[model samples]
Target: MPSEGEFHMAYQGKGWFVIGPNKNGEMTINKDGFSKKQDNFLTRAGNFARDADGYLVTPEGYYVYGIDLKKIKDGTLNSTARDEDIEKLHGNTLSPLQIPQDLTYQPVLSTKVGISVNLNPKDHLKGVQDFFLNDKGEIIKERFLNQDINALANDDNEPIDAITNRKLNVSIQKEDFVFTYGDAEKGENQFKTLGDLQKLLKEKTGLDLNLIKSEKDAKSPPLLLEIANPSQTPITFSLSGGIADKLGLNANGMELKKGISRDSVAIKIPYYSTEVDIYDKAGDKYLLQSEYYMTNSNDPTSSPTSKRKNQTWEVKSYIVDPKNKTPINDPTWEIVGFDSATHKMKSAPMTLDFKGNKLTYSLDKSENHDSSDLSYQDSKLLEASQDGKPRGIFRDMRIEENGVISLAFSNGVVEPVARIGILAFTNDQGLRKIGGNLYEMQEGPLSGNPILGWDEEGKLKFGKIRHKYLET
Candidate 1:
């Protein structure tokens, strides 16, 4: 119960657990029960806070007792204690509940994501559309290029030198198109822009090479070379020399051969996508790139409407690190259903249809589960990640009804630091009163050894704690 800006709890059992000075002059819980001859025994009140030394204590300078979490992590102490186990407990096993003021909560991986939004039924599914192709059968799309020549850099932000004075040799239809990478000059060997290279290839090979930019918002949209063959006919070309990587062409200095089929390549189909912040196992942050597009519907002839139902949306999710982008899951895309008639998901309440949803995104081999929803649903990791803030400084402390004390950090992270230990005895009336609110166990038949555990029957041992409350 709460009383006077302090919290107190009731002990419904026999013996009263107290924390104060023992024989060792160190603040500890009595392992052999309270002493018959009380000297340094301190009174306990619910008014407690972290002292200057980070130890939880009362205003009277008496320390609070709890099971140390470090011992539990080290396997030296058990969190649970029974009557027989309490008999073997000693002073060393009991410690004051101390917290490190500078402790930081580590970041955790995001397992699931949920997003709720209404989609217009008129938005029909768009599959691969036929785009312009060069004579070599390579799909030609305008690249969303950064006009600055020095903008060419790897994931690590390392600058890639321009293709100046380098030889770019590509073979198309048995015709070798060789050009020098240089400024835009009307020379036989020197060519400046990718457009210049495109014109030279068109002149020498006698093929219409149209490089289209995909993004219209690009300032200096250059050529985006996609080698996927749009037609049933295969496109065969080989890069024998110099690097065109920095030139916005996705090709490096490698020998490319053979015909490319549609199914053999991952064509970049445009869709509606969004980026969400996520975390890796090592507490590293990443952006989860998720794209959603209509794939299939129950009624193939009719589109989604108030009458029609069972529309499916394919979602592609992948982990994109600023340093390197990678796929965390095996099959990155998943098909989810949306019923326009009922305005509900056809799948389960908040789960994807995939079974093997566990992912290993970190080198530590730690596995994390993934989830998504259109509406705000109940999930532990999802709620944590949605905060979108780093694990912040320690804010406050909370004591739960189960006697667990948790420290709440500013980043919505609440960690259980310790559990308040309670002790009970067989004969409560036989206990000797030492001082104010302090008692000692008699070594006679009246008093029994300190008993622990949440026994429901026959005396009903153990107790619960109510933080910010006092017993009236």
Candidate 2:
């Protein structure tokens, strides 16, 4: 046997019937299968009385099986009557009753509902504490350590005896270094332009343009330029202090000035000119043919501009109709045709001739790919002014018990446009619930064609109704 947790513990029962009117103006047994029933009594077309326990009362004044409250609460009981029974009672005058054919009942077991409790609250808390604590109620601890001196030994260096330390003198050679700025080429003037002079001062004294500007405003700037020597041997250079004093420039002012040494210096020059040729003169044939003129006056013998002749094209629209004529109004029938791709009903005429069961429709090749001449008997062209009103296309569809109807585009075979329940209906009295809304069937004669159903996988299957009632 399976464990109690694996089994279902819910209420279940079935003993119900749907009571309503039937066709032929007489009371009869309706066997149409219905999957669900409406909860609101006011919305119900006919009176459906229920007992205190929620059992339905038949029209014959007999107590039919009622819905189980437990099942209703658990949302298991779906419908009370079948679809055929409802359709019969819809437009007819006599009362009808529906009976449940199969009757097997089972209730959810109590042991499967949830786990049972027996221990006290304090006892449960103590049980949890005992799992993690010892009898002394203290936590236990453990540790490991090493005690060998050899394990801590690091380097093998000798220890020297301590002695008093003495100071030693170190000497550094002071060589006179001279720094001067001049053109490397003898004929080239190094200070010809302001930019050249700035470059010379920065290269020789390590002073930038901003430092020169500040020195010009300072009361007295120092002439010392700090130079760092990285080489082991001292270098010899002379500082051009006479040139600096004559130019009123300084190497250091208020703070020690550091010499800036750079491996390379980059200079960018920008120039603009409008006389440059935009295109290659040798390769351009148009430029060669056209005389290069400074102004339009170069062609004084001709007009400054020329005008071209006006051009025109024809625009056209075409209309095609398969039936070769427009439609007319009639009371009994609808215009139906096959879809261009699926060969199903694609376009329907507005005014249908139900009396003769004939329809006249437009068949434009541009409008429909399958537009072609189709022959039908008794079809007549009714002369009237064209209103050119927008028309909507409708396709005839059928749904079966416990079946779902969906609208999808033929191309790609994706995306549902609409879904309708097979059990939905509109009665003869013009009062029926179609999935989202209710509509009345117009009074007219129907062809009584069969409407087919589909299996769960969308395959063609058998259905109860021969023809489904289609309304616009």
Candidate 3:
């Protein structure tokens, strides 16, 4: 007869249990605890399996999936469950198992934008609204323009070429200024001295005009408009509102005892989109700028950069229909700019006609979101578009490294559309999701209340974008 030890060897390492004797009756054990003819324990019982120790166990072992009773005892599975909890699990005998899932993306775009119109001109002319004699009794041209002048020139000191209307006399009031030079808004323009108006005139007219203190022992400076008498062949003054319109928005002809005067000059500007931010008056801090990298500068008037290759736009006027000149009610604006960021130039001319106070125009801008609007896409971040829009329409999107949203486009360009906001808490586990994929601070004592996330330099202090992969 076969040795009883040989019987044990037949089922060795397989965790087979004895049931009854076979035909040879060598201890009458079930071969390997299963047989083709004999009814199996797996068939007799509900489920059957071996324990991790290779022992024949009743009612089978635990699921052995992400967790198992043995691993819970050994403390190698990193499970939060106890052995008692794992023992109550429904055993899954499949080759693979299912588990938790944690995947996320930028579900909503909170960024907002406003239109932008940069007006730094390449060239301009000064249309004479009015003028007066200097101390030397030479007639001087007073008003000027940054846009093209439609004046009929004397081919001399007309200041502009086409002097469409003639004898354009103007005078300023003796009261506080109503408007300013190169300023297109009737509101928000105030100057302290007549000298300030003179300086502004130099910018508006592109010609030097001096405000001479003509009166002696006068309480205030008496207006005596003066320009250097370099050209004896001077042009006579007197022009229509056509040239004046391009020079400014709010203009009224002033009549003086001796000199010509104009109270205000409101230059025209282009309309901006509802998707831009303006940062002006940097004080001494130029650390941040728009995505277009634009700023009004701490001293725009004094900065040589403002006068040279400026990002500011140039205001131009065009007749909608030259044929309709008699009742020429066809005037539109042209906003032209030189983009220093992209080293390119663009124009959005022939825009909407002038409206009330120009809430729809540029020459003067209203700080709608206040002086500096910080949109959702604001801060030190600056963005640019190749075609001045999303490179692709909303088709689909995927995530790239560094929390970037790779936007797939209908234009066949799948690029990083925008970056998502990620927050870091001392213990992220402490904070739970509230709703709408948003979270708030919780009442927990974390290791550190570290406020950090993806940096502008495309780096993360801790976590990353890739997630949700499983392995055995």
Candidate 4:
């Protein structure tokens, strides 16, 4: 017989047996009904002992050996049957046998033997077993027996505690104004300062102008416009910004009005001006001449790099009709020739005229003369004909040097022509000796090549005269 608080002697030859509560005190052959047989049995689930052969045999002779059987009988064993012997007889068990009893009159064997048996433990069993086991054993029990219990318990209770202690606070202050770009479509009228206007102008038109408190001379506020270009081309009125147009002032002009008195005026005007002139004459025949001058009251030096501030004349031919007794309007007249024969200088004044239409013109040659004593020099301007021949009157003209000229007529009448020059030149004396009219300058004084195409004289050729028929 086994002693009190001691394992049954018969159980030593067997293995673990799970117990559970039941009404009748009967040893359950089925894995589920064992605990009611005796209170001292380990009613809560856990690893009991194994037999000497390592088979998990119940004290009642039931073989609950494999991991699956252990789990089914006690609900505490691993589901994955890693151990071979335990995995083989998963669900089957041997028939029930009598309970074991020891020699002690205290019924020591009765305490463990008569308990109900189950192969697996319940979900709560390992936790209940931990309540009785040592800390290390409890850890072991938790690792293998109660895998999901503590995690589930913690998951359930933590959110409640978090919710009880939670707190949040928020405050918002209203803004009195909102900033934005441009004029608002609807709302209170917004004021645009001078700085704002400057930014707007820069963004809208790539123009940068200064807002000064006063003009250079009068000490009155004036909007100063400025621009820079590599070449010398006219700065026309179309290029000015809104402020320039609104104030009616030239780039370098000064406003004569001031303050609120000036405010009452819708527009302002500049105080100074500039102009251009052209004149030409063929022998005793006087030619028609015209002049244009573009200037900003705020600045005068701004222009494209290819142009300069001096006067230049464009020539046209005029013919008298004896039959009609009036000037013939032959549009074929062109500035087919240019020459510096009248003057001596690197740059000189030359006469240009149109032959198809007898018209003549001249530039302000007096202003560009090197000195009062030196007269304006002229050079021959040549263009290539259809057969690649230099047909123009200028002596220096040649087809190989200047390219071909293309003319256009409307209604069987000579109207205009396009002259596209195809030659390059160089200042090199040696290449200049080679002849074929090298149109542009070369690198070294005596060694390089020529730049071919239209010469500087060709640049003065007006596209309107060449393409006039296309205008309508």
The lDDT of each candidate is 0.44, 0.21, 0.28, 0.22
Q: What's the candidate order when arranged by decreasing lDDT?
A: 1, 3, 4, 2
Task: Report the lDDT tens digits of candidate 2 across residue range 423-450.
Answer: 2222223333344222222225121211
Off by over 4 Å in 2: 1-46, 58-132, 135-472
Cα TM-score of candidate 2: 0.14
The local distance difference test score of model 1 is 0.44
Score every model by TM-score: 0.43, 0.14, 0.21, 0.15
The digit string of per-residue lDDT tens for model 3 on 315-416 reads: 333212223332122334343444344423344323332111121223222232211222222222123111112222345545443434343435344444
Worst 10 residues of 4 by lDDT: 107-116
Model 3 segments more than 4 A misplaced: 1-359, 364-398, 402-406, 410-461, 467-472
Q: Write model 1 residue lDDT over 177-227, tens digit each, in one string.
A: 677644434345654333555566556543333344444354333223443
Clashes of 1: 18
Top-scoring candidate (lDDT): 1
How high is the lDDT of residue 418 in model 2? 14
Give the lowest summed-lDDT range of ten residues in model 3.
6-15
The better candidate by lDDT, 3 or 4, is: 3
Per-residue error for 61 in candidate 2, Å, reads: 2.7
Evaluated at residue 83, the lDDT of candidate 1 is 41
CA shift of 310, model 1, Å: 15
